[PDB]
Design a protein around this ligand. Structure first.
Ligand SMILES: [Zn+2]
Length: 7
């Protein structure tokens, strides 16, 4: 699956 990090 795809991953997004919103720091
Ligand atoms: Zn993945």
């Amino acid at each position: 699956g795809s991953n997004q990090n919103n720091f």
